[PDB]
């Protein structure tokens, strides 16, 4: 019950995850604590270095392991490249985000996956007590820089209403398709 | 419907496989032997089984089980049957500590079947997979244990003593006999008279850690309950440590409590405890060049050169603080916590750079002006609204002097330098205090001591009205004041002059 | 001041420069209002009576005023403390805090519902076993800052400067202090080897001030002139300078360390563990006085030995 | 009032720090919103406390 | 660029047998 | 690809609290160990320095 | 985990000017003054007639 | 306007909205104009007061 | 602490919201006597002339509150009856002469004679004759005008304030006839006592209603509450002989036209305003208790809104009430010019 | 209805010299130390606004309060001042003690003269 800011983490610095992290670093003015995950710590250091040199409005924090990313963040957002990387980061690893999810966390997956992966992700997140949204993004990294991305969010509607101010920082056309798996 | 199992040292939490190696011989190990390793419990290691068998069980003997009492009784009987005169009467914790010490002494690294509990490589694997299972607080406690105990011994011991200790670890007779032939190995071993300095070095390091970890929460409680009753200078006087050390203890304790609870830390606290230090020292630094430090902010004359400048300095230091904090009278205008978080958070470098002397506010109130009537009507009502703010400042003979800056920006001056700002919606408003000071030369200093309500007024500083009557201001000899008073008052009476004659209320004929 | 004006007016004695300096520094050191204005009156009385005004007096006036700024700030903060005490005693009887304790704004505007009715993001609650949660609970559940002391100090200052008032205030806050008196104060000004190490080489601890694991000062892992070997060699050279100071009698003899005892001859370790000697001087007294010890080899205290007094001291 | 300049002598300097290496001889910038650009150009003697 | 070292040489000092010299260093201090 | 090459070759991390000078000076009560460097700078500058 | 920057007690490690992080609002002239288009009259019925008269 | 671009980091550069404070500008937003509503077949404007505030 | 940027949240709720932080602790009480009377007179405008039962019918006919709506008594949506002249549809006639005195006070840069304001006051009475004959030379209307006089110098004593206000109390009670009033000195003494209440409010006096009762005008015990009536000085014996001179005429059919309301009926309204403003916990709650009394309700909330704003400053005034005031755009600008120029008048 | 000394060449140099942000502090100090003020009731009220505004008051402020209590013979007011000077450890001068001694002697308070004489 401590009055504090929202801990928001971005997992995966790739083709699309880096402009998402830059939009969350620029357009959030002292309203969130930003966490940046990568497999190599030098890539997260480079992303935070560019965000601090260009001038960001929030404080940022690098991560190398998924356990610290799970125990620190209230909101986790994954923007990865392959379905294998997202399935490893969410389900297959020992320190994975959904299998070790705390009560009340919200995990949004922007990586385009299959239907059964998102089904098992939402089912095990609801079993752990957390919330899972699947929101596959449509657009270029230049369109992500301009804040214009297409999001099709599947999951809870109240969780969608909570996550709309974060979704509007990097995506323009954000639709709520319904239950989990529709996006 | 999932219950997260509680994790501790007895059963370690499962970790990932792509983690970096903590120890140096494991980073260059080939990956086939990395895949050869099996996921076993921590006691399945022979060193871990040894530590659980003879060390951890004796620490578990301190609890209230009956088998612990039987083992304590037979250990007392064993140590009394060794020799009675040395350990005649001591408690159960004493015999537990003694047998723990004696079993820590007799640890050797050989073959597991030759009579020795574990090998050296099993101990290295235990150290590597024990350091891998540590968090940031675990690594912090590991470094604190290094600084408290191992660091003075490394500061005292010679490197040949480190080679002797490594030969004692590896326990190979060939390596020991190859080291024993060297005369420089045998002669350069350290003397205990020099080795006794490690006790004093260890005591000093543990004394600094007792300053941090033991006096720290007491200082934090005394400063966080009533900071106006126990300021940091009062704590620095009553405990005698230092001023900056007490403030660093407070900052470190708050940031340590914030970092260990996964909470974003309050960044305003180093701005509140090191406010003068934040304004003086904290600068933006570029990469490929070196910087300096100003000894003084201004090229001035000294106050020891005259008695009157000396008396002015002593009277100003009387009317000043020594240290100003968030609860004092210059910071009494922060009546809302939103203004508190706005002043101390992310804009303190701008808010302190407004005015050099600390005043009861930060700027000036903004008032707006009236628009002159445009006789073309609504044909030209669109033209004042634009895209940007249009700021206009005055110049002239009377206006634009750096020596008269605080007089030309004085709102109680009738010849004030006129500023105007047209908003993009057409509103004509006055300028803010930083907006008025932006048109002059830069003034990049700050006064963190002098507070003007603390000035002396009863003994020596007594301004008399007869001193102001020595100028002999008269209205009959000079009529500029009456003319400005005539220019100030309205001229509504000029139209109802014919409507001595004095103006009365309108008489009603309907009620009369 | 009474004896001063009785000396001046009645006995017509001209005061010396030292007793003028005493009246200057007494009003300067006192934190009451107008002490500087009276010290300047004494300075004027020194100036117009031919008493010498030295520059050392002026530098000491500046130094004593800057030192007594603390007493001035304490006597200024005590007035606001008494104002807040009177306002707290008023508003706890008027009952405005009972109406302010009911969070009707938090009940109408909930933590999950904004002013319009949408769902907002709420941060997750921290673990109650953490330090920050206990600090917030200690902020909320303990007594107020105005109920700690009813009256203030004897001379214009708030209570809490001494250790009895500090321990009483900590008892009212539910904290048993580990440091009751100033004898249990670590006193880092007594350290001799540690500031010598911190000045030349650097911080020997490193991880003493570490927030998240990056503010630690440790040597590099590559080696060379920045590696661990040169730093440990220079630390050993500084400890060798201190041990050379020990050998020449400038420093006291250090006690027996565990590293020193474990490298000794085993007979010396046996004599130390049977005698309980802390310093090697106690071991020398144990060996050179074999009739002093007990029957279990334990060392007798120093007061139980009496040397032979020669009669040649009676000359 | 005709004595000294400012009675404070506690002026905490809040501006940028001087650069000791490499020392730049000329500071000439084409500016857009600098109304003191006449006074900010010309050879001036750099002698102060520093 | 430049990479801040994780100080692995802190861990190489724990490979030594400090229990032979300090007689139970790894436990709690007395 | 144009952002990965342009690293921070321009800025540096800021001064910490109670930091020293690059020449070794510090803001203490005793300034006999600290020195001034105005006599090492050039005597006249074309323009106006930021300090 | 660790915060970016060696200081870890500062919100911004490079410590920029706080006026750099201040936002910039904008307003188009089309929100202030609209742009209207007159229809072609009988004197200039087409756009080529308008270019011929000019 | 990123300050790690060496053409923007240079002290004589017009890719900044000030002179002596810093270099570049972090993510400023400007508004263009779209004069393409006349290319549509039916274009109307509905004057209604703001109701959302 | 800071929320995410969403739903186009405004930076400030008013033009002068952050300008109130740029005042001192006495200047927030100087502007609180000015702006606080402007907020209270604008809040009780729609229920002016309503009785105590008609105000309770407004609060009973609308029982829907979503806990962000305020009291329907304050800024009511009811239909007005005469519904108005031009500028008086947002403030009363008593406030029109109040704002004209503030406009002269802002441009005179300090203290000023009564002749600077005599021509602007008679222009509104010439324009509004129906509102002039209803309120002229009455205790409620005279006290509301001269309420803003200790803003010129709040550290003045009662001897300086009553002497400066005496020129203003003469012209507000003077009518061009020989049938002036029932008593000049009773309206003078009742006004000087409540002006001592607001003088102690700008000085942040502990219990300002008690200490103003000690230094009140003699014979003014009825304008104070009953617990403070023991501390008031009694009337003079020579002043009681002047009351026998009014009874020596014995002309009950010859009733003076000014004031229209009785003087003793106006003492009850100011005494009810001193009871409400004394035990008022906040600025908004003290105004809501003032409009529930009914009657001359714009002059009720002008007394309570000035005395409460003088106690807890302009920052304790709700900023949503300031933005709903129609006259808040020039008056807060005029209130800042009075508070700035009060400490250095150019004439002396 | 004006501060008797406004500014611009009447306030000392070490205070900056007419800091207009503290124009009310300059006007309040002249009302506290007004030698022509004889209203003791305003003198107790003027202490309560200097206490609220944070105005530093030396022994000359309390001596001006104790001086005004002797012609109305306010013996209760003279003891509440000396209680406050003892509460803040501001030692009264002999002129200030003589005012409270004269305020209690003319009110036939013989028991209170002897206990304030023995204090000093
Ligand atoms: Mg003047």
Q: Dihedral sign for Cα B250, B255, B261, B265, please.
A: positive
Q: Which chains pack against D, by 3+ Cβ pairs within 8 A?
A: B, F, H, J
Touch test E–J: 3 Cβ pairs or more under 8 Å: no
Structure tokens belonging to residue A152: 């099709």
- Closest partner residue to F47 (CB to CB) among D18, D28, D50 is D28
Contacts of F15 (CB under 8 A, 6+ apart): B281, B282, B283, B285, G15
Degrees, nearest 5: CA angle B370-B376-B380: 70
User: How does DSSP classify residue H38?
Assistant: T
- Closest partner residue to D11 (CB to CB) among B283, B313, B447 is B447
Touch test E–I: 3 Cβ pairs or more under 8 Å: no
CB B132 within 8 A of CB B22: yes
Structure tokens belonging to residue B219: 């200082």
Alpha carbon distance I63, I55 (integer Å) = 14
User: How does DSSP classify residue C291?
Assistant: T
Q: Give one DSSP letter per residue of A36-104, joined into a string.
A: EE-SSHHHHHHHHHHHHHH--SS-EEEESSHHHHHHH-SEEEE--S-HHHHHIIIIISTT-TTTT--TT
CB I131 within 8 A of CB I141: no
Touch test A–J: 3 Cβ pairs or more under 8 Å: no
Regarding beta strands F44-47 and D26-27, do their DSSP bridges make them parallel or antiparallel, or are they unpaired? parallel
Inter-chain residue contact B323 with C177, CB threshold 8 Å:
no
Question: What is the widest separation between alpha-carbon atoms in chain E?
Answer: 46
- Give chain F's length: 51
Contacts of I190 (CB under 8 A, 6+ apart): I139, I143, I217, I220, I223, I263, I267, I270
Contacts of C151 (CB under 8 A, 6+ apart): C159
CB I27 within 8 A of CB I315: no
The alpha carbon of residue J65 is apart from the nearest alpha carbon of chain I, in Å, by: 15
User: How does DSSP classify residue C48?
Assistant: T
Inter-chain residue contact I68 with C108, CB threshold 8 Å:
yes
Whether chain I has a CB inside 8 Å of the CB on J76: the answer is: no
Question: What is the widest separation between alpha-carbon atoms in chain D?
Answer: 42
User: Which residue of I lies nearest to B485 if distances are taken between CA atoms?
Assistant: I108
Whether chain H has a CB inside 8 Å of the CB on D31: the answer is: yes
What's the gap in Å between J38 CA and the centre of ligand 1? 25
User: Which residue of C lies nearest to A130 if distances are taken between CA atoms?
Assistant: C124
Q: Identify the residue among G32, G33, G34, G36 best suited for mutation to test binding to B, counting B beta carbons within 10 A and taking the highest.
A: G32
Q: Which chains pack against B, by 3+ Cβ pairs within 8 A?
A: A, C, D, E, F, G, I, J
- Number of other CB atoms surrounding residue B98 within 10 Å: 15
Alpha carbon distance H43, C208 (integer Å) = 71
Structure tokens belonging to residue I121: 């006051």
Nearest Cα neighbor of C152 from B461, J89, I184, B499 is J89
Q: Which region, left, alpha or beta, applies to residue H27 given φ > 0 means left and ψ of -120 to 50 means alpha?
A: left
Return phi, psi of residue C113, to 5°: -120, 125
The alpha carbon of residue F17 is apart from the nearest alpha carbon of chain G, in Å, by: 9
- Give chain I's length: 348
> What is the separation of C-alpha B430 from the centre of its chain, rounded to a whole number of angstroms?
38
How many residue contacts between B and J have a Cβ separation below 8 Å? 72
Return phi, psi of residue C177, to 5°: -75, 135
What's the gap in Å between B479 CA and the centre of ligand 1? 16
* Burial degree of C203 (CB within 10 A; 0-12, 13-18, 19+): middle
Structure tokens belonging to residue F30: 């005793």
User: Which residue of H lies nearest to G30 if distances are taken between CA atoms?
Assistant: H33
- Give chain C's length: 315
What's the gap in Å between J11 CA and the centre of ligand 1? 12
What's the gap in Å between B137 CA and the centre of ligand 1? 65
What's the gap in Å between J55 CA and the centre of ligand 1? 22
- Number of other CB atoms surrounding residue B283 within 10 Å: 16
CB C124 within 8 A of CB B263: no
Q: Is J110 annotated as a binding residue?
A: no
Q: Contacts of residue E14 in chain B, CB cutoff 8 Å?
A: 127, 146, 150
User: How does DSSP classify residue C28?
Assistant: H
Nearest Cα neighbor of B270 from B259, B284, B282, B260 is B282
Which residues of C lie closer than 8 Å to A, measured between beta carbons? 118-121, 123-126, 132-133, 136
User: For the sheet containing D26-27, what is the strand order?
Assistant: D26-27, F44-47, D43-45
Structure tokens belonging to residue J4: 């008797």
Inter-chain residue contact A165 with I2, CB threshold 8 Å:
no
User: How does DSSP classify residue I13?
Assistant: S
Whether chain H has a CB inside 8 Å of the CB on A119: the answer is: no
What's the gap in Å between I147 CA and the centre of ligand 1? 24
CB B438 within 8 A of CB B417: no
What's the gap in Å between D8 CA and the centre of ligand 1? 26
Q: How far is CA B291 from CA A98, B294, F22, F23, I327, in A?
A: 50, 10, 6, 8, 56
* Burial degree of I40 (CB within 10 A; 0-12, 13-18, 19+): buried
CB G3 within 8 A of CB A61: yes
- Residue appearing with tokens 């007011």: J77
Inter-chain residue contact G1 with A62, CB threshold 8 Å:
yes
- Closest partner residue to H28 (CB to CB) among G19, G24, G35 is G24
Structure tokens belonging to residue A28: 């959030």
Structure tokens belonging to residue C178: 């580990």
Nearest Cα neighbor of B362 from I20, I229, C86 is I20
Q: Which residues pair with C83 in a beta bridge?
A: none
- State the resolution, in angstroms: 3.1
Nearest Cα neighbor of B348 from J16, A49, I10, G21 is G21
Q: How far is CA E20 from CA B166, C80, E16, in A?
A: 11, 61, 9
Inter-chain residue contact C120 with I3, CB threshold 8 Å:
yes
Alpha carbon distance B51, B42 (integer Å) = 10
- Number of other CB atoms surrounding residue G28 within 10 Å: 12
Helix (H) or strand (E) holding B325: none
Return phi, psi of residue A109, to 5°: -110, 110
User: How does DSSP classify residue B377?
Assistant: G
Alpha carbon distance I95, A20 (integer Å) = 57
Inter-chain residue contact H4 with A54, CB threshold 8 Å:
yes
- B12-19 long-range contacts (CB < 8 A, ≥24 apart) are B12/B42, B12/B133, B13/A67, B13/B133, B14/A94, B14/A95, B14/B39, B15/A65, B15/A67, B15/A94, B15/A95, B15/B132, B15/B133, B16/A65, B16/A66, B16/A67, B16/A93, B16/A94, B16/A95, B17/A94, B18/A39, B19/A65, B19/B132
Whether chain I has a CB inside 8 Å of the CB on A8: the answer is: no
Inter-chain residue contact C119 with A162, CB threshold 8 Å:
yes
Alpha carbon distance C1, I239 (integer Å) = 55
Nearest Cα neighbor of B135 from J36, A67, F27 is A67
Q: Which residues pair with I339 in a beta bridge?
A: none
Q: Contacts of residue B442 in chain D, CB cutoff 8 Å?
A: 15
User: How does DSSP classify residue I7?
Assistant: S
Structure tokens belonging to residue C173: 């806050």
Nearest Cα neighbor of I330 from I107, I103, I116 is I103
Alpha carbon distance C239, B195 (integer Å) = 10
Q: Which residues pair with A34 in a beta bridge?
A: A8, A60
Structure tokens belonging to residue B510: 């309907």
Nearest Cα neighbor of D43 from B441, F38, F48 is F48
What's the gap in Å between I347 CA and the centre of ligand 1? 6
Nearest Cα neighbor of C284 from C303, C265, C271 is C271
Structure tokens belonging to residue B196: 């006794």
Inter-chain residue contact C34 with J59, CB threshold 8 Å:
yes
Whether omega for the bond prior to residue D22 falls within 30 degrees of 0, making it cis, is yes
Helix (H) or strand (E) holding I170: helix I158-173
Regarding beta strands A131-134 and A106-109, do their DSSP bridges make them parallel or antiparallel, or are they unpaired? parallel
What's the gap in Å between I110 CA and the centre of ligand 1? 10
Helix J40-53 × helix J75-87 angle, to 10°: 20
């Amino acid at each position: 019950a401590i009055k504090r800011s929202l801990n928001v983490g971005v997992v995966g610095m790739g083709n699309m995850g880096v402009p998402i992290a830059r939009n969350l670093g620029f357009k959030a003015r002292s309203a969130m604590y930003l966490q940046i995950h990568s497999r190599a710590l030098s890539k997260a250091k480079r992303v935070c270095d560019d965000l601090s040199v260009d001038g960001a409005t929030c404080a940022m924090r690098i991560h190398d392991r998924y356990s610290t990313m799970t125990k620190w963040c209230d909101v986790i957002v994954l923007a990865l490249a392959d379905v294998k990387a997202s399935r490893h980061a969410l389900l297959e690893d020992n320190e994975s985000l959904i299998m070790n999810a705390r009560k009340g966390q919200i995990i949004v997956d922007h990586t385009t996956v299959d239907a059964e992966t998102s089904r098992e992700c939402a089912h095990e997140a609801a079993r752990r007590g957390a919330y899972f949204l699947d929101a596959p993004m449509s657009g270029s990294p230049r369109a992500c820089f301009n804040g214009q991305l297409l999001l099709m969010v599947g999951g809870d509607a109240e969780t969608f209403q909570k996550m709309l101010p974060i979704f509007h920082m990097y995506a323009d056309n954000v639709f709520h398709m319904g239950e989990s798996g529709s996006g | 419907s999932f219950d997260a199992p509680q994790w501790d040292l007895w059963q370690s939490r499962p970790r990932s496989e792509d983690m970096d190696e903590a120890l140096q011989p494991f980073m260059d190990m080939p990956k086939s032997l990395k895949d050869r390793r099996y996921d076993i419990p921590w006691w399945a290691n022979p060193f871990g089984a040894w530590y659980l068998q003879n060390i951890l069980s004796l620490e578990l003997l301190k609890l209230k089980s009956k088998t612990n009492a039987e083992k304590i009784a037979t250990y007392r009987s064993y140590m009394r049957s060794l020799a009675s005169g040395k350990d005649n009467t001591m408690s159960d914790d004493d015999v537990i500590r003694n047998i723990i010490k004696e079993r820590w002494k007799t640890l050797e690294f050989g073959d597991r079947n030759a009579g020795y509990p574990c090998t050296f490589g099993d101990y290295i694997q235990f150290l590597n997979e024990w350091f891998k299972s540590l968090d940031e607080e675990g690594m912090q406690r590991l470094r604190e244990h290094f600084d408290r105990r191992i660091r003075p011994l490394l500061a005292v011991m010679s490197p040949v003593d480190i080679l002797w200790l490594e030969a004692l670890t590896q326990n190979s007779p060939h390596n020991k006999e190859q080291l024993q032939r060297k005369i420089a190995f045998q002669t350069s071993l350290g003397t205990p008279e020099f080795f006794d300095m490690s006790k004093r070095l260890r005591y000093e390091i543990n004394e600094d850690y007792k300053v941090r970890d033991e006096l720290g929460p007491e200082l934090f409680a005394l400063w966080s309950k009533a900071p106006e009753r126990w300021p940091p200078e009062r704590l620095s006087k009553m405990y005698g440590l230092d001023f900056t050390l007490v403030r660093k203890i407070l900052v470190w304790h708050h940031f340590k409590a914030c970092y260990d609870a996964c909470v974003e830390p309050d960044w305003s606290l180093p701005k509140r405890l090191f406010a003068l230090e934040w304004i003086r020292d904290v600068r933006a630094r570029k990469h490929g060049l070196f910087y300096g430090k100003m000894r003084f902010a201004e090229q001035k004359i000294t106050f020891y050169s005259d008695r009157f400048l000396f008396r002015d300095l002593v009277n100003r230091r009387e009317a000043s603080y020594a240290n100003v904090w968030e609860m004092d009278d210059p910071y009494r205008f922060l009546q809302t916590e939103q203004d508190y978080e706005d002043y101390w958070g992310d804009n303190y470098d701008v808010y302190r750079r407004m005015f050099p002397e600390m005043i009861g506010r930060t700027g000036e109130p903004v008032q707006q002006y009236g628009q002159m009537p445009i006789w073309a009507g609504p044909h030209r009502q669109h033209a004042n609204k634009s895209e940007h703010n249009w700021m206009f400042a005055e110049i002239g003979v009377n206006v634009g002097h750096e020596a008269l800056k605080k007089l030309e920006l004085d709102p109680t001056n009738e010849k004030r330098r006129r500023f105007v700002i047209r908003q993009p919606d057409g509103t004509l408003r006055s300028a803010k205090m930083s907006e008025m000071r932006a048109w002059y030369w830069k003034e990049e200093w700050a006064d963190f001591r002098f507070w003007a309500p603390q000035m002396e007024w009863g003994i020596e500083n007594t301004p008399s009205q007869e001193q102001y009557q020595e100028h002999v201001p008269d209205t009959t000899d000079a009529d500029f004041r009456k003319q400005r008073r005539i220019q100030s008052r309205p001229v509504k009476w000029f139209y109802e002059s014919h409507y001595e004659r004095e103006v009365r209320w309108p008489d009603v004929i309907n009620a009369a | 001041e009474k004896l001063f004006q009785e000396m001046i007016l009645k006995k017509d004695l001209s005061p010396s420069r030292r007793t003028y300096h005493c009246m200057i520094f007494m009003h300067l050191s006192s934190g009451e209002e107008g002490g500087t204005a009276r010290a300047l009156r004494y300075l004027e009385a020194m100036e117009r009576a031919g008493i010498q005004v030295r520059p050392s007096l002026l530098k000491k006036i500046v130094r004593v005023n800057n030192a007594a700024g603390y007493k001035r700030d304490m006597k200024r903060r005590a007035r606001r403390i008494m104002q807040a005490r009177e306002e707290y005693l008023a508003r706890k009887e008027e009952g405005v805090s009972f109406g302010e304790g009911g969070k009707e704004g938090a009940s109408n505007q909930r933590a999950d519902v904004d002013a319009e009715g949408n769902s907002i993001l709420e941060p997750l609650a921290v673990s109650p076993t953490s330090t920050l949660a206990w600090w917030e609970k200690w902020k909320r559940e303990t007594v107020s800052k105005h109920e700690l002391f009813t009256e203030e100090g004897a001379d214009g200052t708030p209570k809490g400067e001494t250790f009895e008032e500090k321990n009483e205030a900590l008892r009212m806050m539910g904290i048993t202090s580990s440091f009751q008196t100033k004898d249990l104060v670590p006193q880092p000004d007594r350290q001799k080897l540690l500031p010598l190490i911190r000045r030349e080489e650097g911080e020997i601890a490193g991880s003493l001030w570490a927030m998240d694991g990056g503010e630690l000062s440790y040597p590099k892992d590559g080696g060379g002139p920045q590696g661990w070997g040169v730093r440990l060699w220079r630390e050993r050279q500084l400890v060798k300078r201190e041990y050379q100071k020990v050998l020449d009698g400038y420093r006291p003899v250090p006690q027996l360390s565990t590293l020193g005892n474990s490298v000794r001859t085993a007979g010396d370790q046996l004599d130390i563990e049977r005698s309980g000697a802390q310093t090697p001087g106690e071991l020398s007294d144990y060996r050179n006085f074999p009739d002093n010890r007990f029957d279990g080899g334990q060392l007798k205290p120093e007061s139980e030995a009496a040397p032979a007094v020669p009669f040649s001291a009676e000359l | 009032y005709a004595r000294g300049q400012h009675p404070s002598y506690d002026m905490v300097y809040a501006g940028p720090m001087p650069e000791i290496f490499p020392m730049r001889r000329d500071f000439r910038k084409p500016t857009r919103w600098d109304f003191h650009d006449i006074e900010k150009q010309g050879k001036y003697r750099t002698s102060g406390p520093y | 660029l430049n990479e801040a070292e994780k100080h692995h040489d802190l861990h190489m000092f724990y490979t030594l047998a400090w229990w032979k010299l300090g007689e139970g260093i790894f436990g709690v201090d007395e | 690809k144009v952002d990965s090459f342009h690293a921070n070759t321009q800025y540096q991390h800021a001064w910490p609290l109670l930091s020293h000078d690059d020449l070794g000076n510090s803001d203490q009560s005793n300034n006999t160990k600290n020195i001034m460097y105005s006599m090492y700078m050039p005597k006249r500058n074309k323009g106006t320095a930021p300090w | 985990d660790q915060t970016y920057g060696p200081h870890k007690s500062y919100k911004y490690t490079y410590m920029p000017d706080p006026r750099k992080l201040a936002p910039i609002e904008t307003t188009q002239r089309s929100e202030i003054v609209p742009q209207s288009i007159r229809p072609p009259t009988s004197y200039v019925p087409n756009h080529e007639t308008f270019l011929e008269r000019a | 306007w990123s300050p790690r671009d060496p053409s923007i980091f240079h002290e004589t550069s017009t890719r900044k909205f000030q002179d002596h404070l810093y270099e570049g500008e972090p993510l400023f937003m400007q508004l263009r104009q779209c004069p393409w509503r006349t290319q549509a077949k039916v274009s109307e404007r509905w004057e209604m007061d703001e109701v959302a505030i | 602490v800071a929320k995410l940027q969403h739903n186009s949240a405004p930076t400030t709720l008013n033009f002068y919201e952050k300008s109130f932080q740029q005042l001192s602790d006495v200047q927030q009480r100087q502007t609180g006597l000015l702006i606080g009377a402007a907020v209270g007179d604008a809040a009780a405008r729609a229920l002016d002339g309503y009785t105590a039962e008609e105000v309770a019918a407004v609060a009973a006919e609308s029982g829907s509150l979503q806990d962000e709506d305020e009291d329907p008594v304050v800024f009511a949506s009811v239909t007005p009856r005469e519904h108005k002249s031009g500028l008086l549809r947002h403030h009363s006639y008593t406030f029109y002469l109040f704002s004209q005195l503030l406009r002269v006070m802002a441009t005179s840069r300090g203290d000023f004679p009564v002749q600077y304001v005599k021509n602007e006051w008679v222009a509104t009475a010439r324009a509004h004759p129906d509102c002039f004959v209803r309120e002229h030379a009455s205790l409620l209307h005279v006290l509301c005008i001269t309420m803003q006089l200790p803003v010129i110098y709040p550290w003045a004593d009662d001897s300086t304030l009553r002497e400066y206000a005496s020129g203003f109390l003469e012209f507000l009670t003077e009518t061009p006839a020989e049938q002036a009033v029932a008593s000049r000195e009773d309206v003078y003494a009742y006004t000087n006592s409540v002006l001592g209440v607001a003088l102690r409010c700008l000085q942040s006096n502990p219990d300002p209603y008690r200490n103003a009762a000690f230094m009140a005008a003699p014979g003014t015990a009825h304008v104070f509450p009953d617990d403070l009536a023991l501390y008031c000085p009694p009337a003079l014996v020579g002043s009681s002989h002047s009351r026998t001179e009014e009874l020596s005429e014995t002309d009950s059919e010859t009733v003076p036209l000014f004031p229209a309301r009785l003087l003793e009926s106006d003492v009850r309204v100011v005494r009810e305003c001193l009871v409400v403003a004394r035990g008022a916990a906040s600025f908004a709650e003290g105004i809501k208790a003032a409009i529930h009394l009914g009657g001359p309700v714009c002059q009720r909330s002008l007394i309570v809104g000035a005395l409460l704003g003088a106690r807890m400053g302009v920052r304790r005034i709700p900023i949503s009430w300031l933005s709903a005031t129609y006259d808040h755009v020039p008056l807060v600008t005029l209130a800042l010019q009075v508070a700035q120029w009060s400490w250095n008048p150019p004439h002396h | 209805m004006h501060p008797r000394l406004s500014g611009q060449g009447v306030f000392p140099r070490y205070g900056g010299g007419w800091m207009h942000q503290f124009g009310h502090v300059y006007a309040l100090q002249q009302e506290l130390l007004n030698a022509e003020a004889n209203n003791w009731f305003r003198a107790m009220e003027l202490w309560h606004t200097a206490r609220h505004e944070g105005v530093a008051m030396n022994v000359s402020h309390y001596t001006n309060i104790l001086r005004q209590c002797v012609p109305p013979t306010a013996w209760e007011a003279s003891l509440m001042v000396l209680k406050q000077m003892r509460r803040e450890n501001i030692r009264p001068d002999v002129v200030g003690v003589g005012c409270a001694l004269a305020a209690c002697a003319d009110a036939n308070r013989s028991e209170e003269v002897e206990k304030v004489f023995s204090c000093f």
